[PDB]
Write a protein that binds this DNA or RNA. Structure first.
Length: 107
RNA sequence: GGUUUAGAACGUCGUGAGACAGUUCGGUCCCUAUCUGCCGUGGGCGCUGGAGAACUGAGGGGGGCUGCUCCUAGUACGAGA
């Protein structure tokens, strides 16, 4: 009926939220811009976030694929005030870490 | 415009005339370029018989500044920024 929640643990500036945006593009449209390099929509919401080059807080965005709901949130992996991302864990059961190509997963 | 002419005034100094890089207001800045120099532009002659072209190029001059944006690449670097 509903759809399982999905996380986005982009540790060490993984950029996983951009992957959430591209996933938002793949789940489209039928009427969407398809996003763009940098910010860029991708549910950036508040000003000073996309302008800052990184989200100041975790967002949310409705999505659908394979005939089912697919909520997802990103990124909160920056810094630094990551406790809100820990709050995000209560907000969803799923997860999807974005592993770096640099010496494996970021510390 | 300032400083330095003659007028006037204030502060100060002096018995006073006056004085004060103390201040204030007002106040005629000439020259037709011979030579050198430089910018141009010619005439005379030479270059060896005269003439018309066309280059060669010794040499000399001019020009030479840099922003930003994007890409490379958000890559190297960095725990992140």
């Amino acid at each position: 009926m509903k759809i399982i929640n999905i996380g986005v643990l982009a540790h060490v500036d993984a950029g996983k939220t951009t992957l959430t945006e591209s996933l938002l593009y793949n789940s489209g449209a039928i009427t969407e811009l398809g996003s763009v390099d940098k910010g860029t929509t991708r549910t950036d919401n508040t000003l000073l976030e996309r302008q800052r080059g990184i989200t100041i807080q975790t967002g949310i965005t409705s999505f659908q694929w394979e005939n089912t709901k697919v909520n997802i949130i990103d990124t909160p992996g920056h810094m630094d005030f990551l406790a809100e991302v820990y709050r995000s864990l209560s907000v969803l059961d799923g997860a999807i870490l974005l592993i770096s190509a640099k010496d494996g997963v970021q510390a």
